[PDB]
Amino acid sequence: AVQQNRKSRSRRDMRRSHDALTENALTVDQATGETHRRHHVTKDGFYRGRQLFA
Amino acid sequence: MIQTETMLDVADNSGARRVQCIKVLGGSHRRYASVGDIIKVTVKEAIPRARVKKGDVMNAVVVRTKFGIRRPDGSVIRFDDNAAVILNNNKAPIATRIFGPVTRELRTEQFMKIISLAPEVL
């Protein structure tokens, strides 16, 4: 099964009208004060005022 | 739970030894027969010189099944074989002895004789 007519650019863009991306949830940490992904350990090993690597 | 092509033992001395069910009576597209239901059977093995012969088409009533019967209190009773008793054209019992135990589902005006001649009713 294949198309009988080539699809127009208009209909192609209409189909793609649902492809937009979305933003993550970011938050400024307390103890250190940089941005991190919410509910995740910061890239330097801190989470809720505890250190993972001394 | 007896259906077409099921083989059954014969629980009386009418002469037949093994019968095969060929029809479940009593409704369109009816699937199964349980204790107390009428079936059509063909005779597959019989005692020599009997009143019944091989190749006869007859009526029968189911007396024991392996699938079992339910009771009002939630219990179930199961037997080791499937057995039947032969009837005439008027659907009355036509035997002079019964072999093995029987149930209460035959407490019906149609079926006093089997109970009366049976040794044990459990």
Partner: protein, 117 residues
């Protein structure tokens, strides 16, 4: 006690309080209440306990016996009022909970050794 507290409370009100202790492999006599018309009588069922389920009010046990050449098994609901009396006659000695292997043995092979105190 795998159910909700309300269900347990409603079930506990109907329990029997006089059942004997028995295990698979014993031989028992059960008195069954039979109501023919309004004649009341008791019918005796004697056999070997081959399976037992302990589930509170939903407890059950299966009894197998040979009657005039045909084997027959009945599953009794323990707490039903139709079960009038249970008597243990002889305590068996087995190695497992369910004795379904007895269905394929007859007579000489189906004997159970007696447990000796």
């Amino acid at each position: 006690s795998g159910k909700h507290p309300l269900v347990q409370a409603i079930e506990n009100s109907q329990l029997k309080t006089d059942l004997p202790e028995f295990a698979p492999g014993d031989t028992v006599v059960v008195q069954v209440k039979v109501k023919e018309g309004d004649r009341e009588r008791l019918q005796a069922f004697e056999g070997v306990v081959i399976a037992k389920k302990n589930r509170g009010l939903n407890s059950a046990f299966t009894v197998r016996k040979i009657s005039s050449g045909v084997g027959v098994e009945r599953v009794f609901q323990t707490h039903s009022p139709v079960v009038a009396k249970i008597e243990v006659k002889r305590r068996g000695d087995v190695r497992r909970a369910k004795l379904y292997y007895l269905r394929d043995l007859s007579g000489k092979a189906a004997r159970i050794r007696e447990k000796l105190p």
